[PDB]
Amino acid sequence: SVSKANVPKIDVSPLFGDDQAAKMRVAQQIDAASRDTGFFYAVNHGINVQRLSQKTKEFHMSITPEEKWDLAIRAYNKEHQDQVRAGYYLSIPGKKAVESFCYLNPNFTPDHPRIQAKTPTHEVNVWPDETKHPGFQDFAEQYYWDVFGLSSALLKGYALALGKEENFFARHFKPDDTLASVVLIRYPYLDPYPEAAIKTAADGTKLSFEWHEDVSLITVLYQSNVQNLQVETAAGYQDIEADDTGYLINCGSYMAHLTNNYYKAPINRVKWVNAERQSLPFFVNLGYDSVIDPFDPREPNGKSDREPLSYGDYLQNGLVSLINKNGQT
Numbered sequence: 001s002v003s004k005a006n007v008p009k010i011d012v013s014p015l016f017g018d019d020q021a022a023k024m025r026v027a028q029q030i031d032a033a034s035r036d037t038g039f040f041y042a043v044n045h046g047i048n049v050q051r052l053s054q055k056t057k058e059f060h061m062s063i064t065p066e067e068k069w070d071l072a073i074r075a076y077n078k079e080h081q082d083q084v085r086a087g088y089y090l091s092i093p094g095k096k097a098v099e100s101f102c103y104l105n106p107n108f109t110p111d112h113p114r115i116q117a118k119t120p121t122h123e124v125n126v127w128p129d130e131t132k133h134p135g136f137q138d139f140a141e142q143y144y145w146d147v148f149g150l151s152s153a154l155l156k157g158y159a160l161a162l163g164k165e166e167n168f169f170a171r172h173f174k175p176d177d178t179l180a181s182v183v184l185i186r187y188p189y190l191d192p193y194p195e196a197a198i199k200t201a202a203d204g205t206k207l208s209f210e211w212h213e214d215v216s217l218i219t220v221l222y223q224s225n226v227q228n229l230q231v232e233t234a235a236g237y238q239d240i241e242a243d244d245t246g247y248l249i250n251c252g253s254y255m256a257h258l259t260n261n262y263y264k265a266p267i268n269r270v271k272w273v274n275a276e277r278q279s280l281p282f283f284v285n286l287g288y289d290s291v292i293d294p295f296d297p298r299e300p301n302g303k304s305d306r307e308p309l310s311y312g313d314y315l316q317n318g319l320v321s322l323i324n325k326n327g328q329t
């Protein structure tokens with residue numbers, strides 16, 4: 001038997017305003033959730049998630065195998081040595097059900113000094129033919145900045161929640177250098193569903209993706225209305241209920257590092273469900289050279305002996321480790 005996680009719905013709209021006491025009341029809710037299961041739903045977020053789901057569906061269901069090879073990351077196409085993060089992540093019929101398209105900061109262009117310097121984790125996005133996917137690139141880039149805006153407000157809530165000034169995290173979250181990514185994940189309905197694409201957990205649960213901590217500061221996730229996520233607690237894994245009107249928010253391991261684990265990165269996994277569905281995360285990453293000094297909210301002096309960790313090194317190591325542990329997505 002599996003229990004259900006407490007995932008409160010938090011009205012985040014005050015974080016866009018100037019009612020400072022109202023913002024503190026949101027911060028308290030974020031604090032409580034971050035100290036409990038680690039997840040909450042952000043509601044009243046102001047993003048048109050219906051259009052997000054529709055546009056994403058039109059892309060996944062119309063892109064052809066030729067287009068997927070042409071956009072494929074290095075793991076599926078040896079010709080694209082520069083595509084470690086951005087591009088298409090192909091399914092393997094009979095073996096791997098999931099497929100996805102990842103893109104990064106639209107400001108990463110050939111003119112960008114990090115591209116010029118060839119710094120790891122920075123890449124220029126790849127896109128399909130505009131005529132074959134009209135409006136898709138424009139929708140996708142607009143969405144990047146829409147969810148960037150929501151995430152910046154959420155970071156103000158996390159900052160206040162930890163007893164800091166509201167820009168403590170957001171000051172490092174900038175359009176000119178953010179390593180944040182969007183991933184448009186398709187989980188297909190398949191009949192028969194290949195056993196090879198289903199993993200079995202230690203506790204016997206059939207999974208599509210094994211346990212992990214998020215590589216992010218925070219994760220801002222939209223999913224269609226199909227329950228699949230589970231969060232680990234001391235009493236075992238608990239089901240996270242689906243809500244296709246809000247965003248599921250949680251801390252990543254960079255937040256756990258800098259708070260001396262006061263806000264843990266919740267361990268989560270994806271149950272196997274034979275249903276057509278969407279999983280559209282926005283990983284709130286900072287700049288490559290962003291460093292946040294660790295602190296410990298449990299101590300009067302707030303002192304932490306943990307080393308300041310550069311976000312770029314954290315991200316590079318984290319993404320490679322996640323592939324090594326849980327497999328190439």
Ligand SMILES: CC(C)[C@@H](NC(=O)[C@H](CS)NC(=O)CCC[C@H](N)C(=O)O)C(=O)O
Pocket residue numbers: 084085086102180181183185209212213214215221270279280281283319322329
């Ligand atoms: C919503 C999550 C559970 C989703 N999983 C995921 O997105 C998983 C675990 S957080 N994330 C990853 O594999 C890391 C993607 C990083 C991305 N290519 C980049 O370069 O930034 C899923 O549905 O599988």
Ligand SMILES: [Fe+3]
Pocket residue numbers: 212213214268
């Ligand atoms: Fe995750």
